[PDB]
Design a protein around this ligand. Structure first.
Ligand code: CLA
Ligand code: CLA
Ligand code: CLA
Ligand code: CLA
Ligand code: CLA
Ligand code: CLA
Ligand code: CLA
Ligand code: CLA
Ligand SMILES: CCCCCCCCCCCCCCCC(=O)OC[C@H](COP(=O)(O)OC[C@@H](O)CO)OC(=O)CCCCCCCCCCCCCCC
Ligand SMILES: CC(/C=C/C=C(C)/C=C/[C@@]12O[C@]1(C)C[C@@H](O)CC2(C)C)=C\C=C\C=C(C)\C=C\C=C(C)\C=C\[C@@]12O[C@]1(C)C[C@@H](O)CC2(C)C
Ligand code: SF4
Lengths: 201, 709, 41, 217, 70
């Protein structure tokens, strides 16, 4: 009720009571008035944030090592044109099948929770997660960090969500920077740092 | 429950008086609806301005107006429809437009496609602004009723500010931009070499070279030495020989004078400061010699009712639109408009139909006011009561005039036709056997021709070239304007026009007067403004409401307007338009056959309808084939309308009953029970299709005929 | 919102979306297989 | 109290609670009847005060560079009139450490923070001192009057401890604001007509009063 | 020319008709079946759409059982 809000002095919506991690009462359009919409949108945001962390680290880290002089990997924009041992459509089909099995299992978990928590072929192995979107278990949580006091879990999930929002923004920024200036993201940073006043438009 | 609910949903969508009985809410809804309409109009203007910048040959036409056909639409090549991209010239392919947008842009001084883009962006911004303003003024800051009823302040602002200042601003734009750019264009200067409009404002010697009076500055205006501004503020009259339109200096002077007059006229009605008249006082104090008491009581009627104001405004706007249509063909205001015949025919027909529709709307809303808002107890007015107390004498006399005019205008045509068929051409009403000359119109023409130099000392030429006595004007080998003769053929058609107008007036006025009650149904007011009938009693009471009177009057309005446009088209094609050889011989399009062929009904069927329709029916395979396709499609709609007009409701309900049984047999019966259309709806559907078919047929015929020749 | 979905499912809007998708599809085949009178399969 | 073109209608609602009220309202914009939108007496008074403060800043700011330039206090490269300092690129520009647009963005960001905080205080009172803002929320609580927030941040010298002194200072502030708004309007009109700096206009008028007037221009 | 495109049209029209018939039967048992004919139940309609693929077999089996005609 008294948590910091996105717009101080304003009234937060009645469907955001602050229970969810990373909640700042930001929903001017009211896109999640209904509970089912709230749950679906929360799952979508979590998945987007995790994919963003995965992708953002894979774009700036290689370019940093390339410009510093350690590697020679090409620009991320043109990585889809390089040579490979097979046609890209075959790779697309294999990726589609594997990610299809994974995402189908995840989809089955959302609609009817607890229905996919057992190994199909080795019934001994199970997953110990209890909330949707956080599978837990030995496969995904080897270090045991996913269980504890509720305050610790809430804080960890909040920091994960904030990092995800930052990563999504950074990835979109890298895309638009390379579509506009026509050079690598690190080159843009170095050009800006060389002359912050003038090296923009 | 049933299907009539769906139809009723769209029928009462904009009837705010039925939803609520509070005047404040109706006024607020009306304000917001007006804002939405303004937004839509701005969006339409933005589209029109943008299309001419990207998909048009405006520049090539600007370099050669006479030999290039204007175009602003291009078709995608999907199903072989790209045959509509004709060779309009200028290295461009597309559909030739007839809305006269190129002439407006040329007369406004536009020379490149960069200005049109800016205008389109501005119009889009204005549309967004209007939409936001409508939302704000309905949901956030809605005015009170007392704000809407301050009609003394509304008139002051709408006269001084909207009309007074708009004319002044346009005169300023004309003086500063349109005159020099048009002077440069008329001098043969290539359009890309003309200086930009802001160079005239920034550099003053450039303007001084064209007009020396600009060197003196604004001092002669303040010193009352106004004769120095005569270089660009003239009173010449007549058409410009180079372009064929009115002189732009005359237009600038006219707009300046109009602005000053309107600004003076906007300071009449009283406001907080106590100077000026009050409308109520003017209405009350007025008592002439035959009125007696006067107009006491009209202020409350006109300030507490929206339908009376709507009726009055609709009638005035329709009359104004008809006047505008008449005044633009005879005194062409834009360059290269008179000699471009396709646009001239299209602009005259558009505004006539608009005016007719608006007049019929005025009649309908007067009937609505009489049915709903009339109140003799609280809003008594004397003149309306006296008009209602002798309505039998008004209608019976108007009924007689229609019969007399119809007989003495159509029996002449029938007599001519019979005498021609019997081999007796010396007994017809024509210029060779029995003459019925329109002497008054000829006297008017002579007086107007001789008015300059005697009664108009400041005029160098007549206002228009239609009055006999002027000289022919030729632009690019084509005929722009010349005196129009008047003979026996023009005597009959004018009386045809009078007869049709009188019949339409009779129908509408009878409906309005007998809206409240009649000798047949004394309690017709309680039944409503829009009801089908009152049963088969008293021999039959079909179509007794005022809505049915408007429904009948629409047919006669359509009948009346159609004869006007046919008269205009044939008279202009046969007597004015044409071409001139190098030696000065005029050859009209149809060679002057209107004088002898337009006196019998066979002449209109053979020489006009049969002879002039060969262009549309031979358009297959060419770029004009869309007109040929629309010609045949409109006949289908017109003939399809007759199913609803000739038939009744019970037959279709029984047919739908059998159909519903067949559907029930297979468990596909909808839960919303099908119902045939109501009695009133069946009438409304028929007339809509009738008018659509007729107007579309005439539109395709005219456009296919005039573009080819 | 829920009202946004409810207004989107009404008959006119749904019918317009369906017919627009249908027209786009039909134009797609007419562009891909133009001037067709017989089945060559 | 003195009355300046006061009217019977205007005197009905302009009792005198506002500072520097003279009863002048020929158009009756602030009439308490039919109040809506931005036509509200409280909002109108607030707008007048804020416009007056900004005008008192601008009237001195526009003429400061020209004053010292003639006296030799500043280099001639920075002694430009108010319309040649990059505000109007066609009229002339100056090259700072960055181009004009990034300066515009920085100004927009900073003043957006400031003005949004001020507006949120206007809508609901006292709510700007609750949420943590780098520990500065203690002094930004306001004083219940939107135009006179007070507090340690805005009233550090402790002026107007008594109500009489506060009222006199408010009256003087509003008078200075009105004078400054008139001065800024004069700035704009002189710049548009004569085409030189206002201090240049004053010097030209002083050099030959009989010649350099409106009549000759 | 005619035989091959004819069977395709018959299949498509049967698909459309079967889907339309199956939607009405599902909502007929409700308290206010008329309300579902204006605000279309999209989640319910999406399930029936796939079922029209096998309309010939479905209609053939329903005709034999006697449930085709009321
Ligand atoms: C800033 C980055 C960040 C942070 C702080 C976290 C933090 C967390 N993740 Mg996590 N995650 C991230 C990025 C991040 N993740 C990314 C990029 C992916 C996709 C590759 C995942 C995929 C992921 C899964 C699949 C799961 C977690 C889980 C967890 C929670 C316990 C596991 C853990 O951290 O112990 C280390 C082990 C913890 C709150 C688990 C959870 O909450 O369930 C108990 C869990 O099942 N994460
Ligand atoms: C993580 C966010 C992020 C960051 C750090 C940067 C950083 C940078 N961008 Mg950039 N950008 C972003 C997002 C971001 N961008 C997004 C989302 C877009 C798409 C709209 C762009 C589009 C863009 C263009 C088109 C260009 C840059 C350029 C640049 C560089 C010069 C600075 C400038 O003019 O930026 C201006 C940045 C914007 C107009 C976008 C607004 C900033 C976004 C919304 C983030 C908001 C600030 C953020 C909350 C601050 C907290 C993070 C902080 C630790 C950095 C600089 C390295 C320029 C370049 O290449 O340098 C020569 C350039 O030409 N950016
Ligand atoms: C009421 C105004 C109006 C009207 C009748 C049209 C009508 C048309 N426009 Mg159009 N347009 C308008 C306003 C309007 N526009 C405005 C305001 C803009 C923005 C300034 C545009 C920008 C625009 C572009 C950019 C294009 C058209 C095109 C077209 C044509 C094809 C439309 C189409 O395929 O839609 C498809 C259906 C949709 C819903 C979209 C059609 C004649 C196209 C054309 O002529 O290409 C040859 C084209 O490329 N228009
Ligand atoms: C509202 C319309 C309007 C506007 C905005 C202007 C604006 C202007 N006029 Mg102007 N003018 C107007 C109507 C207008 N005029 C009319 C109707 C006339 C005819 C009497 C003139 C006759 C006129 C002259 C004779 C001169 C101006 C000049 C000027 C400019 C200097 C002041 C200024 C741009 C002066 C100019 O060109 O300055 C560059 C100038 O010498 N105007
Ligand atoms: C400023 C102009 C104006 C305004 C504001 C009004 C306002 C009004 N009129 Mg009205 N009217 C006008 C001009 C105007 N009229 C004119 C000029 C005429 C003469 C033709 C009429 C004739 C008229 C009649 C006869 C009646 C009204 C009625 C009404 C009231 C209800 C209207 C309604 O529900 O429409 C709802 C809107 C529609 C039904 C839409 C009509 C659709 C048209 C006919 C088809 C157009 C076809 C189109 C070209 C093709 C599109 C294809 C596409 C669908 C795919 C409302 C107060 C009614 C009333 O007050 O009854 C008590 C009434 O009965 N008016
Ligand atoms: C899916 C609904 C549906 C079905 C299964 C039928 C079935 C039938 N109709 Mg029929 N009809 C329908 C809707 C339907 N109709 C609608 C909406 C109308 C009003 C336009 C009609 C008007 C109509 C007439 C006037 C006649 C029939 C007749 C017939 C029978 C002859 C076969 C035939 O195709 O006629 C031809 C059917 C048509 C030409 C109707 C047009 C097809 C419409 C446009 C399809 C609409 C589908 C609808 C959108 C379903 C949405 C499903 C969605 C919720 C998933 C047959 C039993 C005839 C008969 O034997 O007497 C009863 C007959 O004379 N119908
Ligand atoms: C027919 C159009 C129309 C009419 C009759 C009204 C009428 C009204 N509006 Mg309004 N408004 C309109 C259009 C209109 N508006 C539009 C298009 C907008 C933009 C969204 C607004 C935005 C608006 C706001 C934000 C407010 C009003 C308010 C009001 C009410 C009080 C106005 C007053 O006392 O004067 C006040 C007049 C002034 C203070 C003078 C302002 C002078 C302007 C700034 C000059 C315009 C410059 C113009 C763009 C120059 C064009 C140049 C050329 C290049 C185009 C009054 C009922 C107020 C209210 O309380 O509502 C009840 C209010 O707060 N209106
Ligand atoms: C010692 C007196 C003094 C001096 C020398 C200046 C000098 C300057 N002021 Mg300034 N100013 C002053 C007092 C002074 N101001 C005061 C008292 C105020 C009101 C508090 C302002 C408010 C002010 C504003 C609002 C702006 C300036 C700006 C400027 C600069 C524009 C001229 C240029 O070429 O750069 C210039 C350096 C402009 C600028 O760009 O500053 C860098 C600008 O926008 N001044
Ligand atoms: C008689 C010639 C018109 C005389 C005239 O002034 O018409 C109008 C006139 C009515 O005028 P009012 O009294 O309404 O107004 C007189 C004005 O001077 C002041 O409003 O009617 C008559 O005098 C007789 C009408 C007989 C029926 C005329 C039918 C046509
Ligand atoms: C979602 C997103 C943007 C967010 C949008 C926002 C803020 C919307 C906000 C609002 O809704 C709210 C909250 C409330 C509403 O009332 C208002 C609005 C305003 C509507 C960004 C990124 C979204 C999506 C992201 C981050 C995508 C990641 C992409 C990856 C992983 C790419 C990987 C690769 O780059 C590698 C690694 C190597 C390369 O060689 C190959 C490829 C394949 C290119
Ligand atoms: S049922 Fe038809 S014909 Fe009979 S009175 Fe009514 S409207 Fe007239």
């Amino acid at each position: 009720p008294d948590r910091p809000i996105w717009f101080p002095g304003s009234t937060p919506p009645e469907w955001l009571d602050g229970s969810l991690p990373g909640d700042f009462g930001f929903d001017p359009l009211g896109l999640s008035s209904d509970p089912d919409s709230l749950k679906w949108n929360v799952q979508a945001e979590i998945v987007h944030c995790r994919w963003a962390m995965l992708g953002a680290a894979g774009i700036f880290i290689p370019e940093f090592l390339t410009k510093i002089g350690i590697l020679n990997t090409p620009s991320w924009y043109t990585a889809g044109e390089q040579e490979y041992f097979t046609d890209k459509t075959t790779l697309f089909v294999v990726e589609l099948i594997l990610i299809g099995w994974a995402e189908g299992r995840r989809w089955a978990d959302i609609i009817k929770p607890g229905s996919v928590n057992t190994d199909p072929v080795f019934p001994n192995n199970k997953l110990t997660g209890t909330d949707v979107g956080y599978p837990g278990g030995l496969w995904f949580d080897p270090l045991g960090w996913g269980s504890g006091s509720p305050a610790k879990l809430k804080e960890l999930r909040t920091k994960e969500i904030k990092n995800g929002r930052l990563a999504m923004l950074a990835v979109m920024g890298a895309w638009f920077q390379h579509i506009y200036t026509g050079t690598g993201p690190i080159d843009n940073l170095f050009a800006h740092l060389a002359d912050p006043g003038h090296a923009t438009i | 429950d049933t299907t009539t609910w769906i139809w009723n949903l769209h029928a009462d969508a904009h009837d705010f008086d039925s939803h609520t009985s509070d005047l404040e809410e109706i006024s607020r809804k009306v304000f917001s609806a007006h804002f939405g309409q303004l937004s839509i109009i701005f969006l339409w203007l933005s589209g029109m301005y943008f299309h001419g910048a990207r998909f048009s040959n405006y520049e090539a036409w600007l370099s050669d107006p006479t030999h290039i056909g204007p175009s602003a639409q291009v078709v995608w090549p999907i199903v072989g429809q790209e045959i509509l991209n004709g060779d309009v010239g200028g290295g461009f392919r597309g559909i030739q437009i007839t809305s006269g947008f190129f002439q407006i842009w040329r007369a406004s001084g536009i020379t490149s496609e960069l200005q049109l883009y800016c205008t389109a962006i501005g119009a889009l911004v204005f549309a967004a602004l209007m939409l936001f303003a409508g939302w704000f003024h309905y949901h956030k800051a809605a005015p009170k009723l007392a704000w809407f009823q301050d009609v003394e302040s509304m008139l002051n602002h709408h006269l001084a500010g909207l009309l007074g200042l708009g004319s002044l601003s346009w005169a300023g734009h004309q003086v500063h931009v349109s005159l020099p750019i048009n002077q440069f264009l008329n001098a043969g200067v290539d359009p890309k070499e003309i200086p930009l409009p802001h160079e005239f404002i920034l550099n003053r010697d450039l303007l001084a070279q064209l007009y020396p009076s600009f060197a003196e500055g604004a001092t002669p205006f303040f010193t009352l030495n106004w004769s120095k501004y005569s270089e660009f503020l003239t009173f010449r009259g007549g058409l410009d020989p180079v372009t064929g339109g009115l002189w732009l200096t005359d237009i600038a002077h006219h707009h300046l004078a109009i602005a000053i007059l309107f600004l003076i006229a906007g300071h009449m009605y009283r406001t907080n400061w106590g100077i000026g008249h009050g409308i109520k006082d003017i209405l009350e104090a007025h008592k002439g010699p035959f009125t007696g008491q006067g107009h006491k009581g009209l202020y409350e009627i006109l300030t507490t009712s929206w339908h009376a104001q709507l009726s009055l405004n609709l009638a005035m706007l329709g009359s104004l639109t008809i006047i505008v249509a008449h005044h633009m063909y005879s005194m062409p205001p834009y360059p290269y408009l008179a000699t471009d015949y396709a646009t001239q025919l299209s602009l005259f027909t558009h505004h006539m139909w608009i005016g007719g529709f608006l007049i019929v709307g005025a009649a309908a809303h007067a009937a609505i006011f009489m049915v709903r808002d009339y109140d003799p107890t609280n809003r008594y007015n004397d003149l309306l009561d006296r008009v209602l107390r002798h309505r039998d004498a008004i209608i019976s006399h108007l009924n007689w005039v229609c019969i007399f005019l119809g007989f003495h205008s159509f029996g002449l045509y029938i007599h001519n036709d019979t005498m021609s068929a019997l081999g007796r051409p010396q007994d017809m009403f024509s210029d060779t056997a029995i003459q019925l000359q329109p002497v008054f119109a000829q006297w008017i023409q002579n007086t107007h021709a001789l008015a300059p130099g005697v009664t108009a000392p400041g005029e160098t030429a007549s206002t228009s070239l239609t009055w006999g006595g002027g000289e022919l004007v030729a632009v690019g080998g084509k005929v722009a304007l010349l005196p129009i003769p008047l003979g026996t053929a023009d005597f009959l058609v004018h009386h045809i026009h009078a007869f049709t107008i009188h019949v339409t007036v009779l129908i509408l006025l009878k409906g309005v007067l007998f809206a409240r009650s009649s000798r047949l149904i004394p309690d017709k007011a309680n039944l409503g403004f829009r009801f089908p009938c009152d049963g088969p009693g008293r021999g039959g009471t079909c179509q007794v409401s005022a809505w049915d009177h408007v429904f009948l009057g629409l047919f006669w309005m359509y009948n009346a307007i159609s004869v006007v446009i046919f008269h205009f088209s044939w008279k202009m094609q046969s007597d004015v338009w044409g071409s001139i050889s190098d030696q000065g011989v005029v050859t009209h399009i149809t060679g002057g056959n209107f004088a002898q062929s337009s006196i019998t009904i066979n002449g209109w069927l053979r020489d006009f309808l049969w002879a002039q329709a060969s262009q549309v029916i031979q358009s297959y395979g060419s770029s004009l084939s869309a007109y040929g396709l629309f010609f045949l499609g409109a006949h289908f709609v017109w003939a399809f309308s007759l199913m609803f007009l000739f038939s009744g409701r019970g037959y279709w309900q029984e047919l739908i009953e059998s159909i519903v049984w067949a559907h029930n047999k297979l468990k596909v019966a909808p839960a919303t029970q099908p119902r045939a259309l109501s009695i009133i709806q069946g009438r409304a559907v028929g007339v809509t299709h009738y008018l659509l078919g007729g107007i579309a047929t005439t539109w395709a015929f005219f456009l296919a005929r005039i573009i080819a020749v | 919102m829920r009202d946004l979905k409810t207004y989107l499912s009404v008959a006119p809007v749904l019918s317009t979306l369906w017919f627009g998708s249908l027209a786009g599809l039909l134009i797609e085949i007419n562009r891909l297989f133009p001037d067709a009178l017989t089945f060559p399969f | 109290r003195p009355l300046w073109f006061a009217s019977s209608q205007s005197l009905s609602y302009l009792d005198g609670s506002l500072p520097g009220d003279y009863g002048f309202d020929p158009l009756g914009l602030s009439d308490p009847e039919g109040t809506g939108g931005f036509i509200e007496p409280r909002w109108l008074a607030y707008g007048e005060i804020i416009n007056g403060r900004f005008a008192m800043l601008g009237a001195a700011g526009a003429i400061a560079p020209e004053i010292l330039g003639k006296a030799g206090l500043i280099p001639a490269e920075t002694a430009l009139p108010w319309f040649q300092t990059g505000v109007i690129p066609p009229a002339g520009t100056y090259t700072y450490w960055a181009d004009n647009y990034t300066l515009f963005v920085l100004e927009m960001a900073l003043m957006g923070f400031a003005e949004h905080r001020r507006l949120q205080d206007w809508y609901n009172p006292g709510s700007m001192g609750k949420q943590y803002f780098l520990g500065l929320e203690k002094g930004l609580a306001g004083s219940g009057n939107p135009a006179y927030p007070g507090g340690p941040f805005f009233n550090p010298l402790g002026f107007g401890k008594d109500e009489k002194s506060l009222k006199e200072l408010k009256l003087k502030e509003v008078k200075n604001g009105r004078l400054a708004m008139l001065a800024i309007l004069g700035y704009f009109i002189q710049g548009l007509v004569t085409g030189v700096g206002p201090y240049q206009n004053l010097l030209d008028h002083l050099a030959d009063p009989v010649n350099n007037n409106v009549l000759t221009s | 020319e005619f035989i091959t495109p004819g069977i395709l049209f018959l299949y498509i029209a049967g698909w459309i008709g079967w889907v339309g018939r199956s939607y009405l039967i599902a909502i007929s048992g409700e308290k206010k079946p008329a309300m579902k004919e204006i605000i279309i139940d999209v989640p319910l309609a999406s399930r029936i759409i796939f079922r029209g693929f096998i309309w010939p077999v479905a209609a053939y089996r329903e005709f034999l059982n006697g449930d085709l005609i009321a």
